[PDB]
C-alpha cells in the first residue's frame, strides 16, 4: 500500500509528540556556527500541518522584536532533535493563516479545556 512506503519506513522518526495546529511548541533545531554545533529554540504557535508522511511538514509562527516570523520544518527532519508541546490551543481550523493578519492580543489562542 502507498507504493514508496517501503523506501520511507526506514527514515521515519520516533519520539515526535502528537501536536495539532493551534498548539504552542518550542522546536529545538541544531545549527552549525562555523562547524560548532549549537542548539537554537524556536518557540511559537503551530499554524498548519501539510500532510505527507515522510514529507510531512509543519509551520510555526512567532513574534520577535516586533516582526512576525514563519519557520517551516519537515516533521521528520533530523536537524530537529526535540519538539516540546508547552500548551494546547483551542482552534476550529486546520490552517490558521489569519494569524498573519492579526497582531497582539487578537493573535491569541483559546486554552483547550
Amino acid at each position: 500500500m502507498n507504493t514508496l512506503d517501503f523506501v520511507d519506513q526506514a527514515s521515519l522518526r520516533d519520539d515526535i509528540p502528537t501536536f495539532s495546529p493551534g498548539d504552542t511548541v518550542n522546536v529545538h533545531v541544531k545549527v552549525i556556527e562555523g562547524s560548532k554545533e549549537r542548539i537554537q529554540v524556536f518557540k511559537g504557535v503551530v499554524i498548519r500541518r501539510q500532510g505527507g508522511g515522510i514529507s510531512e511538514t509543519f509551520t510555526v509562527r512567532k513574534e520577535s522584536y516586533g516582526v512576525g516570523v514563519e519557520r517551516t520544518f519537515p516533521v521528520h527532519s533530523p536537524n530537529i532533535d526535540h519538539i516540546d508541546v508547552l500548551t494546547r490551543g483551542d482552534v476550529r481550523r486546520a490552517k490558521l493563516y489569519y494569524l498573519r493578519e492579526l497582531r497582539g492580543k487578537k493573535a491569541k489562542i483559546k486554552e483547550k479545556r
Binding site: 507504493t3 514508496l4 523506501v7 520511507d8 527514515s11 541544531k30 515522510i54 514529507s55 519537515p74 527532519s77 533530523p78 536537524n79
Partner: peptide, 20 residues
Amino acid sequence: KLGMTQVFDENNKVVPVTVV
C-alpha cells in the same frame, strides 16, 4: 520509475530522489 520522495543525507540535508 516507481515515484519520487525525499531523503536526508548524513550532513542533514534533504535530497529529492526518484525511485527506480
